[PDB]
# Entry
Amino acid sequence: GSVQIVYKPVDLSKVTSKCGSLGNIHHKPGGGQVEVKSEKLDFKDRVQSKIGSLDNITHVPGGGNKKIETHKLTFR
Amino acid sequence: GSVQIVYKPVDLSKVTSKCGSLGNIHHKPGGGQVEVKSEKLDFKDRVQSKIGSLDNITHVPGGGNKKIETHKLTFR
Amino acid sequence: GSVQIVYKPVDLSKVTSKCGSLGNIHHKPGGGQVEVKSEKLDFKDRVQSKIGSLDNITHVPGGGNKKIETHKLTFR
Amino acid sequence: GSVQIVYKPVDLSKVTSKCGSLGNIHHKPGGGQVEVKSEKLDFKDRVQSKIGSLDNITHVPGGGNKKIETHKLTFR
Amino acid sequence: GSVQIVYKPVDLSKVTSKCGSLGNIHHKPGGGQVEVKSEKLDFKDRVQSKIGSLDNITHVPGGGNKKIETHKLTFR
Amino acid sequence: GSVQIVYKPVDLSKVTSKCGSLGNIHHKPGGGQVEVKSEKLDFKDRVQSKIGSLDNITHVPGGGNKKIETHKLTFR
# Structure
């Protein structure tokens, strides 16, 4: 028999920020230290290893707002 | 027999921030230290390892609002 | 019998950031140190390794707003 | 005062074997099989390890009687 | 005071073997098989390791004789 | 005071073999097989390793005789 699909999501949504100032921000961490010892590394399928990383990050967006949309129709 | 689907979500939502100022922010941790000792690493399928990482992060968005929407229709 | 799909997502959404000023940001991390020791690395299929990475990042966009859209229609 | 030691062991002993024949000897064992699986071997002081050995021995001496002589004098 | 040592061991001992024949000896073992897997070997002081040996030995001395003499005098 | 040592071991001792015949000896082992797998070997002080040896030995002395002497005098 007849199959009919109407997929019609509607979106008027708004993500809004006012800020009067960002400033006087001081990221001043002391000296980090890292050691790793390992004797063999053996990686096979879809492995996503990270070893011994040392990150200092200072992220200061005037907005930094996120809107994420996922729309899926699957038919068999 | 006849199959009819109407998928019609509607969204007028708003995510809103007012801020008068961000500032005088001091991320000042003392010196971190990390050590890892291991004998063999042997990773097979879809492994997502992290070893011995050391992160300092200072994230200061003026907004930083998140709206996340997932819409799925599955038919067989 | 007949199969009919109407896929008609509609989107008027807006992501808005006002910031009065960005300034006076100081990323002054201390001297980091990293060591990694290994004898053999043996990587095969879809491996995405990182070893010993030291990073300092200062990211200060006037916007930094993200709108992300994924649309998938799959038929069999 | 005066110390006198006389160490004077005497030995006239005899170890004797008579045999009319050795023979018609058949060392015919079926095929042996050995497996060892281990992660690490880490040996420190005066270690005398044997791992996974497989011995067939056929020892057929005409005598097999034993003489070894060891003499030690230690003074302080 | 005076120290006197007379160390005067005496030995007339005899080791005697008579055999009328050695023979018709058949060392015929089936095929041996050995496997060893280990990931690291790490040996430090006076280590005397053997790994995965496979020995067939046929020893048939009529005499084969060993006389071993060790004499030590140590003074301080 | 006076220290006197007489070290005077005396030895008339004898090792003796008669054999009427050696012969008809058959060392016929089946085909041996050995495998060893290891990823690193790290040996330091007075290490005496053997790995994966495969010995067939046939030893058949009528005489083959050994006399071994060690004499040590040490004074301080």
Strands of chain F lie at 3-7, 10-11, 14-19, 22-27, 33-37, 40-45, 50-51, 54-59, 66-75.
